[PDB]
Assembly symmetry: D2
Homo-oligomer: 379 residues x 4
């Protein structure tokens, strides 16, 4: 790693050990939003890593973001997803597709932890099938009028703004303030894990927003959504790496100190093998993530690469966390140790920002297009 | 299946649907012992299936037990482990190794739902390493004196008797201990990932005196009793794992038939079809292993390797099936509105208790090789 | 297991150890059809097991067949597939769908190892897509006229008769071999099961009598599908034999190979590999026997046959792989039988319906059970 | 990738396409050592990639070697192992541990494809247990006398020199082995019969039998008792070569399956229109790209003079298991055509299998990884 990125890593790891490890159990048990910690992170630049310093951000790159995301998620996975949604899914598309004015109004006040945003694509009847949005935007006067329900929205209860995708005929993106007349929140979902982040429906009933609330041009929405998810996928890959790293750390320390049949568990061959496979899966997932980050930072294509990273990391996080429980034994099954929380948090990384199935379809599609292109050059 | 085992399956299915399915979510949410339902199961003979009627049991066999155990656990996994501990781990060793008088005293009042037992082998410093028991039993006058802590005892807070293993020096012995009794305190209930309706806690013995006739079998038989008990228990846990797997698969199939994506049900996607075929294969395979082990036990044939195979297969299937059930549900899989996330949490214990998967592999390997050496 | 089935197991084991184990390497190395051993098997009844003794069969059941199949295949995988093709794919449909006269003409002469048969469904352009058959049968007078090429036909170069599927919409036909209008393609050069022959059947204006049709016109696809259900139990069992011999090999070796001061079997890792192998095999055998018993009791067994074949074939590949790994360097050379088991195992995931087709068949039945 | 490494990649691909692809079926079928092709590779620097130009080498690095190895092995797996043995196992130790005079005598004439070497560590009695060498070397006057059988020596029947490991001191149990440079032929050395192998059949494998074999005193590479260390550090490098070989086998297997799947029809469409086929292909691509990044990390650590034992073991482990899984799935996608020699898939499956065994089995790799993982946590 570069020197800068090494220092960043140490700052983030110190933060995580100081501020996140001591609350992780509480945040999870009580489904508690980590308010004070998100705000401190805001001051550190972690909620706006890839945002130009001129717009109020850290002025860093996606590799730095990937590194920071891992270290944060290692401390608290919920804190990780909150940070990832703000960077990749909220601020991301606004920097990419927004006017100078939209950036001033909707980026800058959301860079410091005073306000955060959210991303609303999924609906109760469709999440993988993104283009099947039934939520409608209709132009009427100096306004777009929004009607429908978005589902599963991370940060719904804490967000001051949302990038919302609505059918205009055919999908468009809109900047929506929160709260706003004609927008109500559903009840907070009761989740298996990442319990400190809020997840709730967004309910639009003749919600009016000004005409310049549209992000990009009408019909650009599906493309805005897909490109934003490419970036988001790197963030989720990093979160999954943090979850996996901390689960592995937990297994190693335990197994070194737990005695069985006369010696530490780490004298048993089978334990060494579990641990070696855990380390291989994690390091492999990490390199795929950094590849995808560096490609994005060099303005090269990264769709296949982000899908691979998210896929590899999420499945490693679930495998590794399972094996951490197994190595701990009975201690793995109770809330006295952190391993059972790891297994619970890990499990969402295979679902959100495109299920594993979707990721494979994306990779396959890009694989097959690349070979078809190479074939055509002959003709 | 025999006509009689078909009628049992239906009785159990009908009972789980009426009595367990409606309470499963609350039991899990509140960590709440299903006391009324256990008493009802007691009355149906389900807490003493392989006990002779003359001792107040159902007079059935281990095949019937595995079937009933699967149907119960399909309904509620916690009720499952509670039924299994009483049947296999508590009542089982007393039927196998007890005197006639011991069976009348310690089996018969635990055959009907009013009293249940527990099994206490594991300790804080040792669970897989069973023979490392540092709980001590010392002969003093008219009593055995017990000192030490047992850990992870399922049914600790509701149990009226325990089979406790303690070092007396072939250095371990098995003891019938009443609960409550002077010198015994319970630890705090464990806060578990799943099977939250079952209680789990430490048994703490300080100068705990029990009569000399409390010993089960002869002194030094303890390790053997424990190991042969776990063999029977493992068929019970395999059957619980099957029930968790079956209900997770039922959940995924009903959901996928009704959820639309890209114009049609999820079950029209080839990928989803493949998930469900793998799930069905793993489950049916595990069930046959389980039934093989039960039938061997029933015909008074060895079944150590076969019970370990069943427990290993079933339990790893439960975890794989329940994971895939969540995946098929999508977002709905990650929330308590659906039961998928509960099956995932419940399935996970089955790879740990009554011998970890690693312990299972070592047992299977040991018996494999003996079979080649005797050929 | 019944005592009758217990005795059959020992006869087949005895036979395999005397007649098959000593030639397995040669059969494989030289791609050599094991003609003398197949004749002896014919004399024992192994090539006509589920056939009534009135038609010269053994008069046994599919459970007996699956046991015998596993013992033969443990001895030599090519002898196993030759025997399975004759029992399940040739004689099977003729028994189930043929007339009295058809049985006497086409079964009775093929029950004793003098004459064996074959089953021709696949074509160069379609194997999984079995209904896509482009070979044609036209009715010209008191004959059928066949035109087209069938592909991958096991026993092609040794068979005296074939059950051939032709588009008429598909029908089944008994074709004698040799016959005017029929020629054989070159033998395939295979990764494994090299002692069985595999080749194309090429029909050019091939004329056969009108009474050659098996069942009614249009029944062909159903006859083919019901045949492959039976065949799948056979391949399951072939696969169990390969797997079993691979595991026998590994255990003997590991007990007697020293490393770091003890046998390999003293290493915890080797014990785990062995435990997983035994678990995969034993579970696959139970699925396989469930399918054979459902068939013997006239119960549906499509899904169960599919599960048995899928489980058994995937176990044969995983176990043979681990057999090579336990042997180390010795696993990679022809001095040991492990590399041959790896090569033989691999076909069982492909023929009689690929693993992917098995999963589709299983899923279809599963969903219908819930409807 | 640097422009230089991009040129090299194209050179090796072109060579492979021009010289290796057309001989691979024959080399495999007939167990034929591809001597003309190895000589040409020699002229291009491929047999001495990390050797300085001043000793007659290509003057490049291990990243270049890894890239070159993958392209060579894609064309012919046997040519790949022949090249890897010469680079990593023969030349490697001489460059790392040899004197100036040893480099001139034993490196320089083995850099051009006229003479290649071999590496003799394993014995009939022991491979994984490398330290149990019973072949002996006794100091007799001004000479060393060797007695014993080495087993499994790649290039045995074509080599003009060997790096040979022999027991020189059974009293000092951790300084027990020494390394020796031995010419081929030499009085006292005879070869065993060539092994009949599942795959990589163009390479020779056979026993080296020493009986009263006297070699001069300056034949010892490094100090007496250093042999086990020289051998282990040599295998660390070799593992990067073998990982690259395995990538090449996996890549050609994947190329094969994709071409077939796009062009084979079933149920009225190409196989690639089936989801399950797309899934098979996505998993293949992910396993390969992941293994490649692990390999490049290890090569890069070596080239930067950093520790790479764990990383080399991870790479060899990931690549070798990917090659076997990918080649297995290539056969499955071809269906019947996958089982016959008319297509190359069955050969890729046979070649891939060796990569899980030699230069330290998969089991040894996991023990190595676990050991270094644990040491990191302790430090
Ligand atoms: C805690 C949580 C937080 C979330 N955060 C956000 C957020 O902030 N903003 C937002 O917009 N959304 C968010 N999501 C939505 C999330 O991305 C979706 O749940 C996910 O995309 C899957 O969509 P779905 O739940 O509708 O499942 P479905 O689309 O019904 O999928 C069900 C199953 O079918 C599979 N499937 C679907 N299509 C195909 C296909 N073509 N081929 C093969 N298989 C297929 C899926 O992979 C899955 O296994 C969140 C969800 C959760 C649970
Ligand atoms: C909810 C719950 C209920 C339980 N019910 C009961 C009960 O009613 N009564 C009772 O006595 N106990 C009970 N158990 C205890 C249970 O059986 C043990 O947790 C289990 O045997 C593992 O023992 P351990 O927790 O001490 O883990 P450990 O023995 O510390 O093992 C930790 C890891 O090391 C591995 N390991 C251990 N030894 C070896 C070895 N030799 N080779 C390879 N790997 C090894 C294990 O497989 C595991 O992966 C229960 C546990 C729980 C969590
Ligand atoms: C040695 C050998 C012996 C054989 N014996 C006989 C014999 O005696 N008689 C006979 O008639 N045939 C025989 N077969 C043919 C064998 O059954 C076929 O190879 C098998 O059906 C696969 O068909 P295919 O080769 O045409 O491959 P394809 O049908 O082209 O399939 C290629 C790949 O696509 C997959 N695929 C195809 N359709 C689907 C789908 N809908 N969904 C998902 N995946 C799909 C396949 O599973 C496979 O993975 C033999 C083959 C061999 C190699
Ligand atoms: C074609 C070929 C080429 C080769 N090239 C060379 C060469 O050029 N020079 C050379 O010196 N050698 C060479 N080798 C030797 C190769 O590196 C060995 O085959 C390998 O190290 C395994 O050694 P073994 O065959 O003695 O197997 P064994 O050591 O007998 O092992 C057999 C099984 O036990 C396992 N095992 C052994 N020890 C342990 C342990 N402690 N824990 C867990 N599992 C263990 C192994 O993983 C393996 O699965 C070659 C081998 C082959 C087949
Ligand atoms: C052949 C194939 C494509 C079947 O799917 P498809 O072509 O769609 O055929 P189906 O959907 O079953 O429909 C055709 C009829 O065959 C019938 N059928 C299918 N399998 C049957 C079986 N096992 N028994 C009886 N009937 C069967 C179906 O019931 C169906 O009847 P209807 O038209 O009344 O609905 C595939 O699923 C399969 O099993 N292929 C076999 C591949 C194989 O084994 N190849 C190697 C053979 S030689 S080694």
């Amino acid at each position: 790693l570069p020197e800068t990125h090494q220092m960043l890593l140490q700052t983030c790891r110190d933060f995580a050990e100081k501020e996140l490890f001591p609350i992780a159990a509480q945040v999870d048990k009580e489904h508690l939003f980590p308010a004070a910690q998100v705000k401190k992170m805001g001051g550190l630049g972690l909620l706006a890593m890839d945002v130009p310093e001129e717009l109020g951000g850290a002025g860093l790159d996606y590799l730095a973001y990937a590194i920071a995301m891992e270290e944060i998620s290692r401390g608290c996975a919920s804190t990780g997803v909150i940070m990832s949604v703000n960077n990749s899914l909220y601020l991301g598309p606004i920097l990419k597709f927004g006017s100078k004015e939209q950036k001033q109004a909707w980026v800058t006040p959301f860079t410091s932890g005073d306000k955060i945003g959210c991303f609303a694509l999924s609906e109760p009847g469709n999440g993988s099938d993104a283009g099947a949005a039934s939520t409608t935007a209709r132009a009427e006067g100096d306004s777009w009028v929004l009607n429908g329900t978005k589902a599963w929205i991370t940060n719904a209860w804490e967000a001051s703004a949302a990038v919302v995708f609505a059918s205009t005929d055919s999908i468009s993106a809109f900047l929506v303030p929160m709260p706003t007349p004609g927008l109500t929140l559903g009840k907070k979902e009761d989740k298996l894990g990442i319990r400190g982040s809020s997840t709730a429906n967004l309910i639009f009933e003749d919600c009016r927003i000004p005409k310049d609330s549209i992000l990009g041009e009408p019909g650009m929405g599906f493309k805005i959504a897909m490109q934003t998810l490419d970036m988001g996928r790197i963030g989720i890959a990093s979160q999954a790496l943090g979850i996996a790293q901390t689960a592995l750390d937990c297994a190693v320390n335990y197994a070194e100190n737990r005695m069985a049949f006369g010696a530490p568990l780490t004298k048993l061959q089978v334990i060494q093998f579990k641990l070696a496979d855990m380390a291989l899966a994690l390091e492999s997932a990490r390199l795929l993530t950094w590849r995808a980050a560096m490609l994005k930072d060099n303005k090269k294509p990264f769709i296949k690469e982000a899908a691979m990273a998210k896929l590899a990391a999420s499945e490693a996080a679930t495998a590794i966390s399972h094996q951490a429980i197994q190595i701990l034994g009975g201690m793995g099954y109770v809330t006295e140790m952190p391993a059972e929380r790891h297994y619970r948090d890990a499990r969402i990384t295979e679902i959100y920002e495109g299920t594993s199935e979707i990721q494979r379809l994306v990779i396959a599609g890009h694989l097959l297009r690349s070979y078809r292109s190479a074939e055509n050059l002959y003709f």
